[PDB]
Amino acid sequence: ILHSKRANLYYLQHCRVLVNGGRVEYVTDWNIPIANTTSLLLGTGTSITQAAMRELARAGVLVGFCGGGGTPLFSANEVDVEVSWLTPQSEYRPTEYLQRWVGFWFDEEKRLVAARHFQRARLERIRHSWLEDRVLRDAGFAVDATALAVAVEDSARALEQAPNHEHLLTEEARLSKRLFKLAAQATRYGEFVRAKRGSGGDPANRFLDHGNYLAYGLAATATWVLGIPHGLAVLHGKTRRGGLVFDVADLIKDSLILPQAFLSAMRGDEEQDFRQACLDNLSRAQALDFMIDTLKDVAQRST
Amino acid sequence: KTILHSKRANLYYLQHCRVLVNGGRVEYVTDEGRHSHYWNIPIANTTSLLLGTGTSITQAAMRELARAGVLVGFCGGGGTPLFSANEVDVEVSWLTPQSEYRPTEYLQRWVGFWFDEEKRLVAARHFQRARLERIRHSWLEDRVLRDAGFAVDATALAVAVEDSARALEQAPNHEHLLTEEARLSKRLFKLAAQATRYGEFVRAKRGSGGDPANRFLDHGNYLAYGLAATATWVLGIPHGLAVLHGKTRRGGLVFDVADLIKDSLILPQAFLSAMRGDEEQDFRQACLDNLSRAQALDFMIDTLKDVAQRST
Amino acid sequence: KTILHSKRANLYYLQHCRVLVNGGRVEYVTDEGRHSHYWNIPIANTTSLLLGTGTSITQAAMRELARAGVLVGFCGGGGTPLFSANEVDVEVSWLTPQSEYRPTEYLQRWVGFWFDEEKRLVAARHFQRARLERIRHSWLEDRVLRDAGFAVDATALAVAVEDSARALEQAPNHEHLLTEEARLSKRLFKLAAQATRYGEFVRAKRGSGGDPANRFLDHGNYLAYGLAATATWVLGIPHGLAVLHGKTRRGGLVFDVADLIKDSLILPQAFLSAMRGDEEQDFRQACLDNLSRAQALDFMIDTLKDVAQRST
Amino acid sequence: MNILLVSQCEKRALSETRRILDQFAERRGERTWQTPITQAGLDTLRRLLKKSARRNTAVACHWIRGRDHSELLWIVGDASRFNAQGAVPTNRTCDWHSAEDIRLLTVMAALFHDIGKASQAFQAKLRNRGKPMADAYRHEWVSLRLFEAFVGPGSSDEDWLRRLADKRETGDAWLSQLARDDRQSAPPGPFQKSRLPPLAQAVGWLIVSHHRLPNGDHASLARLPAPIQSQWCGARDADAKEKAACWQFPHGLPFASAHWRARTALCAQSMLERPGLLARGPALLHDSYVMHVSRLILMLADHHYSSLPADSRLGDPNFPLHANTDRDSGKLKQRLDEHLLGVALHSRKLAGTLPRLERQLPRLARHKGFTRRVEQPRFRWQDKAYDCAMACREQAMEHGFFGLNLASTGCGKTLANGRILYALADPQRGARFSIALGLRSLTLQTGQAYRERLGLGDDDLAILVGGSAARELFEKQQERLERSGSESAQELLAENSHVHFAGTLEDGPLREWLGRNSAGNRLLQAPILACTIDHLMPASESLRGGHQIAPLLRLMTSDLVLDEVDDFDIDDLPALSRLVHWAGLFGSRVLLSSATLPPALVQGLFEAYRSGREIFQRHRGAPGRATEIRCAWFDEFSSQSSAHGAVTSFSEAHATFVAQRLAKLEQLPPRRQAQLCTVHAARPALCRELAGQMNTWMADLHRCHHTEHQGRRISFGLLRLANIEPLIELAQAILAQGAPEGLHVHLCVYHSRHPLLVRSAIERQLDELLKRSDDDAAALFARPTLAKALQASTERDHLFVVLASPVAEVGRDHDYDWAIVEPSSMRSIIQLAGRIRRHRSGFSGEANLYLLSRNIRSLEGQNPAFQRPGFETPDFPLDSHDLHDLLDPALLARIDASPRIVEPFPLFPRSRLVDLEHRRLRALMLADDLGVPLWWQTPASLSGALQTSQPFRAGAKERCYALLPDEDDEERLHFSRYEEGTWSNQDNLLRNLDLTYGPRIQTWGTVNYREELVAMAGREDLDLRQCAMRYGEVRLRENTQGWSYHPYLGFKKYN
């Protein structure tokens, strides 16, 4: 239920939230710390009432309606700002990460520094999931070990310098292009070229798109939890819609979605089974908590 | 495919119903004692929903609502806030869609200029300058209101607006701006009561009024808040980044945006509907007609754009 | 029970149909090649029918029509008279109900004053005095026409109407009155063409025009004739007792009564519909709207009553 | 606004109507919705309803205009369920005079069409999975020979019919009566003398021409189909064994099959029962309408059934023969009996379907932009034309129409044409017409401009982008198609061609045969189509293939507009005459829209239309109607109309209208003044000299004419050159020469050799920056693209110059201040004059148009100098090539359509340019001192001889190229070449070109290929490489050395 204990979030599934006796009680056909940091995430087969919303409103409990398992995040309550200029009088807990994000965002130098930190975290996740953890490999995802290490080292040696955002984007594209071929070799799926715009008919392409959708939903949940808007991207262009969501999701995109997609293509599993496997893997690695921690660290390590 | 969010006409206030998905359609159910009636909601033509007392929503219905960009708010019945946190009240608990990815230019401008107190008081002054202009426009230079029985004393309205503008020009800070806004609203209430030969009107607070004018004003505040929330979400600006009503109201940008049309379109219609013996549904439909005819949502969006652009 | 004949809104122009009784209902049938479609006629809300080219009626349908006081006329298609008796033309062959018994006061007044030539020219002058007043009213002192794109040169209309009234005051006989009416109608056509930026308009006779204005004028003449026939029958005055257009037109009282609204409501609407790219059905509906809004039938009834009363 | 939606849908349409309308409105009744809405939302709802609309869909939207006055806004779907006002009935209860003959002929020819596939050689070739061997004889020819065998020589038209009608007949001894072209003594053709009765001859022509037209060689034309010989239809030089193999039938012809013989007997008995059917034999044989409608049905049915999968529900289950093999695997697919029976069934179904096409196809009705009157005195002839068309509507419907829109350029003729053809339509049903622009290739920008001018969305107007393609795959793909045994499997329309339409394609009447998203179905379902005349030419000029089906169906089911019809080259005129004749043949109404129509061309086209309309009237409509074509004339000053049954009265009426128009044209004030310029007489030197002169010339023109605001002078100019390679050379010469003196110059290169998307981008920029009006300096200087360019430099004077090929004369609404024009033909001069100050009023009197004394092709010394484009030929030479002698000096004072519309007398065809043009046009079109009238005077439509003797777009053999990005790397671009459904790689043929920039000269109105490609791929939601291969073609003549490519100059040939 506790999707991300680092942020105090809860996931409710197949239960009706209502108020009887002045206290919210989730009558499933639960003991929750109703306080300024509760942040419920209602899921499949859940219905809420107006009284439930009122009692969750005079407790500082932000409420969001997410999909099945946690992603996507359809709609959620809006987090307020803890800026001293405003004086929000409520039981809520306004966040203070938007202030730091705005304070570092406009200078291109600090934006680039944060983007390079993002890429470093991405590569570290690749090396941890692909090599340090053999659970995926033992599941049937034997890799070329040394080749992946060489590619990660080359990507790090390219990202550690060459300023300008386009250079970082090109480096990320090259890393992904090499990584896809390495994964194809590892799983022996054969020759494979990713079809842009989600037009591919191969199992790998559709599974990769589904994983992209799940990761984007998770990133939206993380940004909503922290309170940063989606516009203030760090990697993508300032004109890209939902840039921050894509940047946050890219941390766990290549590390987890690619191996699970290739393994599900090998096994020939259905889309629902692949999605369930992806959700289980994301739960295992504390993906949401990792993205929240990475955003918090990026914000704090630039002041 | 659904209409552009700024070109949508409907707005729904619901009570004593159950909002759910029935056969792929978003519908609300009302219990008629021995039967249950399912009524469809045109999500592709509705800007926002308002769920009053005795409502409830499900995850499927909320998923289909947050896929055509339909905002959902949990208001309170009888023109009453959701609750009252001691000295402050919150009226609507907004559930803005998050899967829709919104434009990313106005948001950057707003976050860039929003953290400077002087640059944020400049924005409040610019917001009030448009409110006064639209009040003047609607009350005087438009014939639809006059043909419906609204006969405002042109000289009195002109002098009131001129005094309000003069006070605005010499505003030292936010408190005096709020005081001037309250004074203008009270004088406008008196003028509107006189114009519709409504009698003696005294404004009641926190939905304690009994006469139709007070109830209709309290109800129309919700429509104004819904339109303002829709506009702010469409431009991608968070509700919390207020410029004037941030001292006491959570999500104050909604109230600041709604103030542009609250005194210019809601106010005359409240007294016109009271004088006509209208029920709440008829007043709501009349207010929606007034907002759609005058393109209130477009005015809110354009004013937000102008404030953001001039902020630079 | 049916509505009062002066409070009825509909008017029907029919073509290429078969009017009959189907299951106790008066309906007309149109052949769609492989099917026949039956359309109902609201007899309890229709003042009169007009059967154009290719129509036919039965005895049962005509019996049910002449039981709610619904007049039936056999016009000609494309704004053409029924036929042309050498130098004169007849447009509508009226079938007035005879089982309904009409009031018997206005008829006595009309037959009493009608056989004196001086007392019948006095009536023609009084008829033209109301036509001028209604022209002035509709063209100038009413906003509905102006809000739809009609912007008449106020000074030119005023001087034209003043000259027409001055000519009326010194009218020696019927011929000069007819000449003045024709001059005023031509000048009004020119003014209306200028007002709607229609270009250069030259009036065509006997339905020979090709531009939309001529066709719409020829069509609206039929609606005017229908309303006038309804009014004359309602007051109980026979169609034949004319005061102005009795020299060349059978049933001239219909034309005399229709002249009151022909130049004041049909004329602006013809050019307004022409500029808007309207078909004949849309122009007909617009004209019916104008007549119902301005209460043209009530004006005709009241003018006939006033002429009869002042005759004594 | 408040709208009220009422639905009369049924069955499957009701579910979708409810699903769509429940999202936009609230229910009021069982089938009634109502909601407040905005105009944009209303348009969105209407387009959503029209996209997914079946045949049962019927939705009406009402509106409240004025109290007590409702107004029907539109009806989506079946409009017959509502009356004019939108009501509904309270209860509903229950002209082709040669349809049956066509149906019987088509069915019989379908049954006998592939009877020649029983040959041992053909069966072996179908079963030969190894190396293919070309068949000696075409299967159509042996099918015709078998028909001759069965019918018997000299047999009467009733004897063979009765013999085939006897089901108890298995006398295969008739095979002994067969002939064999493989055998010696040269057996007589099946059509000569009495080898075929007059009816079996018609069926034999239908059989022999179900894949290609019998184009042969060589009084002969008038005697058709008699002179048809074996050498006319295919045939190859092969050994005697191969020739003999095509005649032996080991497994027997499909006569033993019970179902085939039963159907044949049924058809024969039906033909015999028909009263007088065996009497119209010679009449039907030479009737172009009957034969061509029968052949269209037969070919479409064959094309449909050749793609269907095998069916065991009809035909002998264990028949030994076969018809085709699946191309995917090569295994045998269809038995011959099943194929023939299916082709016959679909032929009968199509013959039944065709009469319903005038009511089942979508139409455009209730449009207000075509009926709304104008408010400005300038555009007040568009209303006179509409009134004139409405006055004729009934007579035009009853007898036909041949309109002539002779209004001068810049008057807004597109809206006038739309309004005229909408007025000619029945108001209850709606209008359907085509806009055939006289261009080689239609860009997307021109289609969008047509949509904007007519005020129509993509739900009402479709655009057939690209240009027509001559047969290139006729050698490679035909091999595979013949090997598979289904030669009628090629697409009805070309492959790269795309129809940009977003309307009702769900339940179209011809969905079964054409497809659903296929480019023929969109071409037919679109109420209004914007194509080129080259797209409709394959209707009448298709020799080999089914390319003639979709254009022909469009011709039968629509009207016709020929925009810029005189722009066609003189050699291509007979093809246009044939197209007009067939437009008049199938009941279409043609409206010619050109400002410079000479009398001879108009007379020839009218004669063709009248000849076609006579035969159409003989088959469709009330019999006995006299051929009185309702001719109409439209112009900027008035509009007339009259009926004419001969070219003798039509010529007089045209002359009268031309005289009146000229009289009214003389009194017009002058707005263009032309001055002759004499140039000083290879490429790198001549172009350099021209660029040197066009500095002083441009300076003088800018000084004379310009716009002044805030002390800054900007002037827009145009330089037109006859050919492209000289244009590119002169562009380089200007570019590496710099500004003349302090006069900053912006140059734009615009020709037809750029990529299509690049060309459309250049057109989009030039159509947005070159829109001018009187006293528009304040807005002109505030335009962003102009603003940046002006502010960047410090010079107060700017020269925005456009260097354009003859492609800038058609479809370009541009207002220039001055122009330097090379002389090609008088029409070009008039069209380019009609563009300098075309929107503005007020003339300063100084010369604004400069004409060079002689063209480049004369400076180089080539003779004839006025050719490609031009009219000069060795047969019609010119005594001079200097404009000082070929032009009347009085013409430079005022240039308009006057020299072109009227015919000067006496004609001096070797000293005056316009006299030469008129002499050539009257020599070819009419007669004067292989005639065009032979297309309808003699039965030449039964063979492809005319299409080969007078070809269309003959000469150069262009090849399709593109800048395809690499599959692996999007950044890398590869110069490809469409060879046969596969883009090869030709990087070795392309090289970069280096451009040198002079002082103070940049390039304006250009585009980057990559950015435009990605932008249009995103707009169309298509793959980037797919977008490149679909809208980035460039047609270049084959050159061994290759080409040099620059983004701002296009592809220049390299040697």
UniProtKB/Swiss-Prot annotation, chain A:
Which Gene3D superfamilies does the UniProt entry name for this protein? CRISPR-associated endonuclease Cas1, C-terminal domain, CRISPR-associated endonuclease Cas1, N-terminal domain
> Which EC numbers does the record give?
3.1.-.-
- Asked whether the keyword Manganese is assigned, the reply is yes
Can you cite a GO biological process for this protein?
defense response to virus
Q: Which GO terms describe its molecular function?
A: DNA binding; DNA endonuclease activity; identical protein binding; metal ion binding
Check the record and name the Pfam families matching this protein: Cas_Cas1 (PF01867)
What cofactor does this one take?
Mn(2+); Mg(2+)
Residues that coordinate or bind Mn(2+): E172, H236, D250
What does changing H236A do? Answer: Protein is unstable
Cofactor note text: Mn(2+) supports cleavage of ss- and dsDNA, while Mg(2+) only supports digestion of dsDNA in vitro.
The record's keywords, sorted A to Z, are: Antiviral defense, DNA-binding, Endonuclease, Hydrolase, Magnesium, Manganese, Metal-binding, Nuclease
InterPro entries found in the cross-reference section: Cas1, CRISPR-assoc_Cas1, CRISPR-assoc_Cas1_C, CRISPR-assoc_Cas1_N, CRISPR-assoc_Cas1_YPEST-subtyp
Q: Which domain of life is it from?
A: Bacteria
Q: How does it assemble?
A: Homodimer. This bacteria does not encode Cas2; Cas1 must interact with a different protein to insert spacers.
Q: Which family does it belong to?
A: Belongs to the CRISPR-associated endonuclease Cas1 family.
Q: What is this protein called?
A: CRISPR-associated endonuclease Cas1
Recorded source organism is Pseudomonas aeruginosa (strain UCBPP-PA14)
Swiss-Prot record, chain D:
For this UniProt entry, the molecular function terms from Gene Ontology, in alphabetical order, are: ATP binding; helicase activity; hydrolase activity; metal ion binding
Q: Does the keyword Ubl conjugation apply?
A: no
Annotated EC: 3.1.-.-, 3.6.4.-
Q: Which Gene3D superfamilies match?
A: 1.10.3210.30
What are the BP-aspect GO terms? defense response to virus
Question: Where is the motif DEAD box annotated in this sequence?
Answer: 563-566
* Gene knockout outcome: Infection with phage DSM3 inhibits biofilm formation; disrupting this gene restores biofilm formation upon infection with DMS3 infection. Normal biofilm formation in the absence of phage infection. Decreased production of crRNA in the presence or absence of phage. Disruption of the entire Y.pestis-subtype CRISPR region disrupts crRNA production but does not alter phage resistance (possibly OLNs PA14_33350 to PA14_33310, plus the flanking CRISPR loci), indicating this CRISPR is not involved in phage resistance.
- Residues annotated as coiled-coil are none
All copies of the HD Cas3-type domain together span 95-305
Q: Which PROSITE patterns match?
A: HD_CAS3
Q: Where does Mg(2+) bind?
A: D114, H210
What EC class is this? hydrolase
Alphabetized, the UniProt keywords read: Antiviral defense, ATP-binding, Helicase, Hydrolase, Magnesium, Metal-binding, Nucleotide-binding
User: Subunit composition?
Assistant: Interacts with Cas1.
**Stated family:** In the N-terminal section; belongs to the CRISPR-associated nuclease Cas3-HD family. In the central section; belongs to the CRISPR-associated helicase Cas3 family.
Describe its function: CRISPR (clustered regularly interspaced short palindromic repeat), is an adaptive immune system that provides protection against mobile genetic elements (viruses, transposable elements and conjugative plasmids). CRISPR clusters contain sequences complementary to antecedent mobile elements and target invading nucleic acids. CRISPR clusters are transcribed and processed into CRISPR RNA (crRNA). Cas3 plus Cascade participate in CRISPR interference, the third stage of CRISPR immunity (Potential). In this bacteria Y.pestis-subtype CRISPRs do not confer resistance to phage DSM3 or MP22, but instead are required for DMS3-dependent inhibition of biofilm formation and possibly motility.
* Protein's name in the database: CRISPR-associated nuclease/helicase Cas3 subtype I-F/YPEST
Report which gene this protein is encoded by. Answer: cas3
